[PDB]
Design a protein around this ligand. Structure first.
Ligand SMILES: O=C1[C@H](c2cccc(Cl)c2)CCCN1c1cncc2ccccc12
Ligand SMILES: O=C1[C@H](c2cccc(Cl)c2)CCCN1c1cncc2ccccc12
Lengths: 304, 304
């Protein structure tokens, strides 16, 4: 029993973190095999962040200008190239701690663990979600760029995020491991619109299923609804429209609890229309949307 | 910017997790140097959990009855002994992955990271606090016993908790690494009273300071209070009484923000008396108490 905002164990990712310095800028890098991946703005000073021409700035940089340190040892840089918004620094030594890995571009609403890093050293791990507006509500200070987001399937690490930027709003933007930003964001210090952040409806329903499993049942009611009726309410509350794909994914949790997905939708509808009335669900006074249906089954079954 | 319920990186602890089996019972063990620490109820079947005589049960067990597996390799057990509620299994091989470590008995209100484990394999990491009633609101299923709680200071791991039990209430009880339970709990399957769970006032104030630092300021008011006046309100709301020691520890956050500790107390008093009125603080609709003043400074300064 108990339901926590749980992150994946970070050991496999810690063994990949390195420090990358170029000129006066220092950030984190990800060392997998003989390649170190990092945000391309490592070649930038604060001044050229206003309007950088990355290709022109990179021309002034040679292999020896990229200092890569793993713990206390220096890595020899034998190659450099820019792939979208990331630099790939080829080093002469394969990371002996490279786990089995994949690079994946996650979908909005999917969750992942972040290993926040400063100077190539890990400071903390937390779980978060890719918001529908392609931002992440992280916890990142200056120097945390190059910190990565990931998921683990038994022994395989699927890297899905690389931290690059903090918006003036305090939320975070970054890329997949091929250097493509999630959302419309550019690696420029300019005013950028994040967009309307809607609630991940399928995740809130999964979390309601987790609450029933863990004993919190006060919110279950005598009502049902339809997908279209529920969606009229979800629209009014800036909740993502629920589809049959979402209903299908909630299948296992619906079977585990014996509560039909549309009946759970009616409970959600009533919570949206009436509020929590001063009560809590799984120690929260708001509807939590950073647990996917897969996360709930995993945490409630103890997959290692 | 951003404030997350952040856990320590778990790599150092993952390298210590092993599986311990005795008879038909399997749980987790902690391998440090040539010793494996685990809950003493590993010698128990479900039947003798009702009223076990651990010393009599242990008499029927020899070194070869304790199977200790680290990954896929078996460890040879050359010694066994019971220290309070934990067993110490001496093995013939020192853990090559043993980090610098200490065993510490934490104080109620202190926080720590938990690496939940099943069959000696890590499944997830989350941050939690030792409640004033000596329980932890964890996320643990059957098989998670022997999972440990810890803190990290640069490279030293301070082990502070070993999971043993889930109370009928759904909360968790366990021991320090010398086998002494936190609180009044016994390792018996019997009805046990957890006690009144009060809110950790100094932690809520630290979290309010973190909110001001991260930009959420709506709750700051034009009022002040005294320690005695504040405590009259804290009593009414089952909040821990605030002392001058708590005020002194909030010193650095008070200096960082320029908000006197008693002025922040008045903001807290008003939030307790008036509620949140449908608003949030750091993405929460309730007052969060699982961040110590040390946690807030660390997360807001990026200590690795
Ligand atoms: O956002 C940035 C800068 C930036 C500006 C424009 C585009 C890009 Cl790609 C990056 C570069 C310096 C580091 N950085 C930061 C990244 N995360 C958290 C931060 C917390 C406080 C202060 C800066 C932070
Ligand atoms: O609580 C217990 C049992 C127990 C009973 C009485 C005293 C002691 Cl020391 C231990 C032993 C089996 C595992 N266990 C569990 C520990 N944590 C989470 C659990 C979630 C669901 C079911 C059992 C859980």
């Amino acid at each position: 029993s108990g339901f926590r905002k749980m992150a994946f164990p970070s050991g496999k990712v810690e063994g990949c973190m390195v420090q990358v310095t170029c000129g006066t800028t220092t950030l984190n890098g990800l060392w997998l095999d003989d390649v170190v991946y990092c945000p391309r703005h490592v070649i930038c000073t604060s001044e050229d962040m206003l309007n950088p021409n990355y290709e022109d700035l990179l021309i002034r940089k040679s292999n020896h200008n990229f200092l890569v340190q793993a713990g206390n040892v220096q890595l020899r840089v034998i190659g450099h190239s820019m792939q979208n918004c990331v630099l790939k620094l080829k080093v002469d030594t394969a990371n002996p701690k490279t786990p089995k890995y994949k690079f994946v571009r996650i979908q909005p609403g999917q969750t992942f663990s972040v290993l926040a890093c400063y100077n190539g050293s890990p400071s903390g791990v937390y779980q978060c979600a890719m918001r529908p507006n392609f931002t992440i509500k992280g916890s990142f200070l200056n120097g945390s760029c190059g910190s990565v987001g990931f998921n683990i399937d038994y022994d395989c690490v699927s890297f899905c995020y690389m931290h690059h930027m903090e918006l003036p709003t305090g939320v975070h933007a970054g890329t997949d491991l091929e250097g493509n930003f999630y959302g419309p964001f550019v690696d420029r210090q300019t005013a950028q619109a994040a967009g309307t952040d809607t609630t991940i409806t399928v995740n809130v329903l999964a979390w309601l299923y987790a609450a029933v499993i863990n004993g919190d049942r006060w919110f279950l009611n005598r009502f049902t609804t339809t997908l279209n009726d529920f969606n009229l309410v979800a629209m009014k509350y800036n909740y993502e429209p629920l589809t049959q794909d979402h209903v299908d994914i909630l299948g296992p949790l619906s079977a585990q609890t014996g509560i039909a997905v549309l009946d759970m939708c009616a409970s959600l509808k009533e919570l949206l229309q009436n509020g929590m009335n001063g009560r809590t669900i799984l120690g929260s006074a708001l509807l939590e949307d950073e647990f996917t249906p897969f996360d709930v089954v995993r945490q409630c079954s103890g997959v290692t």
